[PDB]
Write a protein that binds this ligand. Structure first.
Ligand SMILES: CCCCCCCCCCCCCC(=O)O
Ligand SMILES: CCCCCCCCCCCCCC(=O)O
Ligand SMILES: CCCCCCCCCCCCCC(=O)O
Ligand SMILES: CCCCCCCCCCCCCC(=O)O
Ligand SMILES: CCCCCCCCCCCCCC(=O)O
Ligand SMILES: O=C(O)c1ccccc1O
Length: 582
């Protein structure tokens, strides 16, 4: 081009450029004040415009990595603030850039960000919308140094639309708060997946990643040819590798190439790539990334023809094992947008074991003659779990359905921490209200994506402070066997009851003045604690104690002497409840 900055600036826009540079610097210099980044931004935008004007102006020829490294190395307190990172400045590119990557702290000290009052928030927004949004863009980016910037920028825009709209509403809090919470989760969800869709690539290798990729792509581009899906799966694997390595530029560039590629051969790949492909440079891929499944051909053959009716099956499989197996996934995946990707992998794996254990036996056609029957029970397990858990979710509500999971898992692994159980059981419940509202055709996929993060979250906590070998069994198992492993946990007969504690079961009228999502957690904490005390309690006995409590809480929060009623009836409840169990 002659000048990268000039070109990036030109096809990015001043607004987005200023935003991305800010995020970029906040991801490395996680400890410099906000006003310090604002200075650098202006400084780099000034330079950028200098190059837009004259392509041959000072340094405009330098590459973006070099320019970026110099501005980084000009920070005076670099060595005093980051120390070892300052040594990176002594080496030259590419060694210098590789050195900054290695010193990018994944999770720093930084205090938890707190949400101020809607009023001060809206007033700050109104008074000076820009430093209000940029300041927080800064707060988020320094705490999540691996979050793809363009992505973090999409969230910024959404946060903007929530303030513009709600700070102008009658009841601001009632408008903004729900939108903010919804953004937090979606944000944390997006982050978790990115960390997950790196760790996986680290542990299980390229092969397993590609497998996951073929299934996922053919499920969405069912009309594309297998050769096209292979091409995409390849480029797609290169993208994640780089993006995971942390180099933003390389990552962003590879993602752009891919998106332009898909859009040119658009006709050859999905038909639903319409709007996405006419959108600006910055959103194209993020759009392609969420595009819905194209419709499937409907004029499609049967799999058993090419994969079971032995017309030279082993002769085709030995000729190129992975390609053939890849072809299996493609065919099976695109006929089933309703299966979770892992289920597709379990089938593909099951098929693989058969071909291996069959093709080395006299007459093959009859050894693997009935594989599709091998599949049947693999497909049903997840399906039965869905509708079974979804019907329970309708009978009870999100909350009561939450208490049910609570009793179910506290019994599975009583060893686990009470606060951890409450949180995991809550997320699980949400996945229920977030997916059970879809038609059976899109439930399994939904559950899979939500369940994959909740399960990894659960697994990471257990990493730190281990508690059960069973959880560790599942957590270190194969990604394709992780959820089935958890589903296979049974009551812990071995478990020895926690000693009764008066304290843990005492309640003051303060619960009457606590928020909805606070009363619940305090009751749900008492529930876990109750089950850990009486692990042999029946669903009947437990419901009796829970009905007595539900009433007791009102009988006292609806009375004039709150805290007498809580200490008097309280002794009774505990006394009676203790006798009803044992
Ligand atoms: C990701 C870009 C954020 C840009 C600034 C928008 C304002 C964010 C809301 C401030 C509160 C954050 C904490 C929370 O929601 O719990
Ligand atoms: C001043 C240079 C900042 C460079 C890092 C930000 C990336 C700029 C290009 C944006 C391309 C995004 C491609 C995509 O996600 O589809
Ligand atoms: C609340 C913490 C529970 C920790 C251990 C149990 C994890 C079970 C979660 C995965 C649920 C899969 C669906 C099922 O119940 O079969
Ligand atoms: C996380 C709570 C989900 C609640 C709804 C029930 C879902 C049952 C599990 C289905 C698992 C699908 C993914 C897979 O094939 O392993
Ligand atoms: C050994 C006797 C312990 C007695 C204390 C009962 C514990 C109360 C937990 C029940 C929570 C029910 C939640 C609800 O109604 O929403
Ligand atoms: O990031 C992409 O370029 C992409 C392309 C096709 C399908 C899913 C994706 O994430």
């Amino acid at each position: 081009h002659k000048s990268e900055v000039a070109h990036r600036f030109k096809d990015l826009g001043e607004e987005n450029f200023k935003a991305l540079v800010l995020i970029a610097f906040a991801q490395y210099l996680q400890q410099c004040p906000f006003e310090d980044h604002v200075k650098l931004v202006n400084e780099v935008t000034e330079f950028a415009k200098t190059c837009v004007a004259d392509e041959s102006a000072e340094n405009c020829d330098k590459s973006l990595h070099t320019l970026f490294g110099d501005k980084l190395c000009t920070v005076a307190t670099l060595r005093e603030t980051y120390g070892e990172m300052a040594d990176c400045c002594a080496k030259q590119e590419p060694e210098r850039n590789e050195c900054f990557l290695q010193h990018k702290d994944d999770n720093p000290n930084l205090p938890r960000l707190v949400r101020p009052e809607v009023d001060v928030m809206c007033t700050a927004f109104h008074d000076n919308e820009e430093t209000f949004l940029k300041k927080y863009l800064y707060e988020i980016a320094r705490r999540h140094p691996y979050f793809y910037a363009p992505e973090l920028l999409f969230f910024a825009k959404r946060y903007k639309a929530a303030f513009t709209e709600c700070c102008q509403a009658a009841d601001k809090a009632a408008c903004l708060l729900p939108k903010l919470d919804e953004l937090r989760d979606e944000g944390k969800a997006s982050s978790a997946k990115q960390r997950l869709k790196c760790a996986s690539l680290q542990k299980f290798g390229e092969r397993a990643f590609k497998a996951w990729a073929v299934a996922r792509l053919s499920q969405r581009f069912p009309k594309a040819e297998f050769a096209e899906v292979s091409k995409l799966v390849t480029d797609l694997t290169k993208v994640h590798t780089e993006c995971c390595h942390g180099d933003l530029l390389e990552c962003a560039d590879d993602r752009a190439d891919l998106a332009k590629y898909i859009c040119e051969n658009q006709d050859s790949i999905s038909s639903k790539l319409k709007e996405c492909c006419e959108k600006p440079l910055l959103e194209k891929s993020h759009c392609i990334a969420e595009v819905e499944n194209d419709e499937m051909p409907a004029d499609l053959p049967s799999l058993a023809a090419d994969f079971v009716e032995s017309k030279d099956v082993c002769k085709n499989y030995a000729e190129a094992k992975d390609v053939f197996l890849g072809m299996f996934l493609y065919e099976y995946a695109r006929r089933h947008p309703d299966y979770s990707v892992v289920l597709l992998l379990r089938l593909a794996k099951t098929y693989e074991t058969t071909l291996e254990k069959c093709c080395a036996a006299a007459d093959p056609h009859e050894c693997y003659a009935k594989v599709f029957d091998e599949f049947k029970p693999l497909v049903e397990e997840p399906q039965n779990l869905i509708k079974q858990n979804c019907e329970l979710f309708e009978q009870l509500g999100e909350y009561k359905f939450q208490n049910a999971l609570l009793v179910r898992y506290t019994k599975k692994v009583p060893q686990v921490s009470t606060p951890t159980l409450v949180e995991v059981s809550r997320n699980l419940g949400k996945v229920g209200s977030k997916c059970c509202k879809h038609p059976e055709a899109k439930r399994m996929p939904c559950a899979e994506d939500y369940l994959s993060v909740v399960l990894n979250q659960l697994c990471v906590l257990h990493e730190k402070t281990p508690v059960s070998d069973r959880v560790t069994k599942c957590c270190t198992e194969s990604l394709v066997n992780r959820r089935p492993c958890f589903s296979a946990l049974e009551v812990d007969e071995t478990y020895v009851p926690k000693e009764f504690n008066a304290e843990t079961f005492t309640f003051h009228a303060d619960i009457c003045t606590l928020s909805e999502k606070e009363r619940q957690i305090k009751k749900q904490t008492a529930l876990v604690e109750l089950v850990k005390h009486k692990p042999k309690a029946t669903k009947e006995q437990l419901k009796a104690v829970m009905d007595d409590f539900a009433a007791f809480v009102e009988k006292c929060c609806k009375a004039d002497d709150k805290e007498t009623c809580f200490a008097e009836e309280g002794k009774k409840l505990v006394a009676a409840s203790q006798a009803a169990l044992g």
